[PDB]
């Protein structure tokens with residue numbers, strides 16, 4: 002029964018055929034349990050640690066490398082030699098890296114409390130019911146409550162299901178609906194039905210929502226829905242249906258592996274095809290084995306060289322470091338991958354109150370009727386000073402200070418504000434400041450009467466804490482607050498019934514003090530106050546009052562206005578039913594207009610800036626506020642979302658105007674709008690969806706479970722540090738200070754990160770191209786292998802690892818925020834960066850192969866064979882090119898490889914400095930610009946020596962220390978890369994800018 006709010010208390014009792022006195026019976030209990038299930042949210046079956054890992058080897062590249070480790074194992078076994086001491090390191094290390102990397106990949110789900118699960122924090126363990134099998138209340142497992150039974154809730158309880166209230170035992174029932182919205186202000190319930198069948202939870206004043214708490218009272222209700230059929234459960238389901246897309250980066254990388262996975266394979270085919278000539282070799286000669294083992298060897302090396310094995314660890318470290326860096330700027334990023342996608346942010350929809358504003362309400366303008374006479378009319382406008390809740394400030398007219406007391410209408414105005422209130426001030430000891438106690442809109446009002454002091458009450462005597470509620474406590478004397486009819490969006494006003502304090506048997510004198518939104522209040526006024534006199538509200542004076550309000554709310558002041566009225570001859574206490582808020586407006590009629598107060602919820606001192614920072618960065622900012630369309634547009638201009646005079650006839654909508662437009666125009670409106678006023682519960686989600694259809698990475702703020710869905714959808718769901726728990730667990734980033742500017746700071750910081758990530762990505766992949774050229778060369782020229790996988794790995798993992806990480810601290814661009822949002826379609830390394838990074842590789846290739854062939858031919862300690870065709874043969878089945886030669890095992894000597902490796906390691910340290918900037922010379926951008934980079938380079942080179950001397954390593958890696966002469970040959974064929982890139986860089990700065 003999900004429309005219980007609109008049905009009568011009797012109707013609900015009938016629907017389920019249950020008695021309010023005994024409740025369901027054990028036969029009804031079982032029958033109900035079998036039809037609706039148990040009252041709880043469905044448990045989660047998290048992915049299996051093995052399932053996750055398995056899915057990581059579901060990747061194409063991880064396979065191509067896996068297979069290799071397999072090709073490596075077969076070879077590692079089908080081999081005969083004394084190098085057996087390290088004949089399995091290769092297929093071992095390969096497989097290992099594959100493990101360590103998969104884990105790192107899976108380290109994106111271990112710890113990440115999600116909303117769909119955090120929602121159990123709100124369902125309680127026990128509930129209280131009245132069942133036919135007893136007279137007293139029994140407290141059963143909430144898990145076992147079903148629709149239709151009778152429950153009981155009292156102050157302190159967490160409502161165990163969606164319950165329709167049957168009767169209120171206490172004087173008034175108060176509920177804390179915070180887990181849904183965020184607002185602590187408890188709400189008042191009633192048992193009277195709510196007509197509208199499609200009423201929103203906020204108007205279902207007769208329902209108690211599962212997961213909420215009883216602030217004050219005791220009540221009895223009939224359970225309407227349970228499990229995933231409640232409000233929270235319905236939200237919990239939306240969550241579960243929300244698909245989560247891969248970050249524009251992941252998508253780009255995942256596609257790179259496809260691109261890479263194809264080439265790798267294509268090259269293993271061009272290799273074979275090149276050695277097809279072997280088809281013309283005597284069967285009775287050579288070897289059908291040395292060929293298969295050779296084609297298989299250079300294939301494995303080929304894969305190992307093409308894949309940047311260190312990338313995963315580098316990206317994961319950069320993002321970890323990147324997270325801590327945001328935290329320093331009060332941006333808690335929960336998802337690592339988010340530190341990346343944050344920079345692609347193209348749209349930011351931010352709530353106003355508290356994010357774009359301080360949420361520190363303050364009254365700074367008010368007016369009463371000065372006089373009415375014929376068509377002539379005059380008001381009495383004022384101004385107040387002090388924006389803090391402190392009772393420190395003053396009232397003044399025409400910038401000149403006046404004493405409020407000297408105005409009667411100001412006394413009344415003051416009386417209402419203090420009587421038709423519900424909050425109060427409180428001076429803090431530690432903080433040493435006055436803290437608001439209750440609604441911010443009210444406290445401001447409380448703070449007002451303390452500044453006005455219409456009764457000249459001597460307060461300068463009183464201490465801080467004493468004068469806090471001084472002037473208020475005084476007004477609370479002149480009248481007795483009988484009862485108060487709560488505020489309801491229905492009539493958007495509220496009132497309190499009062500009677501004079503000094504009065505024994507006086508049956509005349511009671512007054513009702515109304516406070517609410519101007520339109521409603523003012524139309525229920527037949528009289529207008531003028532001092533202490535009163536005269537009929539005439540058409541003119543009405544337009545006068547309304548116009549001053551339009552001004553204060555639509556002008557540069559952007560003030561929230563409250564009209565204040567009083568019912569002079571209120572209905573008799575007896576004739577009022579204080580149980581049907583549907584009658585409250587009626588009670589609040591034939592009113593007299595007393596005054597108007599205008600308060601301000603001031604924009605954060607850093608929003609205008611951050612908004613400008615956004616116009617530059619080409620980032621659209623969409624505000625979502627509670628204000629009306631009029632004040633909303635007005636606030637938008639005030640902070641810059643709109644230009645003072647720019648037309649916004651189609652760039653600002655109110656939830657209502659939005660629902661009127663057809664599903665097509667709504668999509669069109671989401672691409673142009675910048676201001677949403679009075680939005681519906683399901684709008685933020687629709688907004689996010691219509692924005693995503695335009696391929697825009699969206700940031701969406703908001704909290705409480707009503708917002709959870711939207712946040713889950715948006716690419717960057719933002720919660721407040723002071724927000725609900727579920728809001729946070731559903732968001733990608735938390736604002737440790739609730740400040741809009743923190744958002745912007747994070748986008749910039751994400752922009753840095755992506756650029757540096759794009760820097761080291763090219764760094765590494767280029768290193769891979771040089772290696773692939775190196776292998777393919779030593780293969781197309783039948784030369785002996787220059788570099789082997791075990792070496793390449795230590796390179797692409799460590800040597801190249803640290804510097805790539807170092808690049809993480811590369812200084813950001815100064816115009817980092819003065820260029821549009823990176824389209825999630827823009828590729829990584831392409832175009833100029835292809836040719837540019839192709840040549841670097843091709844050089845790196847030739848340079849390594851050359852360094853090998855050199856030692857082999859033009860080296861002293863090396864068996865010179867200049868033009869001896871290392872290509873023409875390696876077979877050595879003739880021994881002709883070395884008649885009196887009894888040694889051919891030098892074609893696998895460690896020296897030449899140690900030459901090839903040293904070249905690569907040196908060239909990469911170089912390119913690491915060439916990588917400080919994409920197109921800037923090291924002249925303008927010295928090496929020491931990035932200290933961490935210089936550090937890693939040393940840590941690497943030295944580590945290069947570690948594997949050349951420490952006995953185990955040098956042999957295991959198949960390397961031998963180099964002579965001070967040979968090393969002189971490395972620098973000779975390494976250092977030059979720095980000039981080559983400077984050239985390509987030069988070619989970009991000058992002949993590539995237009």
Ligand SMILES: CC(=O)C1=C(O)N2[C@@H](C1=O)[C@@H]1c3c[nH]c4cccc(c34)C[C@@H]1C2(C)C
Pocket residue numbers: 057060062063066098099100101102103106253254255256257258259261308309310311312313
């Ligand atoms: C551009 C591109 O598609 C990719 C890549 O380029 N990479 C990863 C990848 O998916 C591969 C990968 C994922 N998980 C591991 C664990 C161990 C080793 C590897 C991987 C190799 C692949 C890597 C890191 C090069």
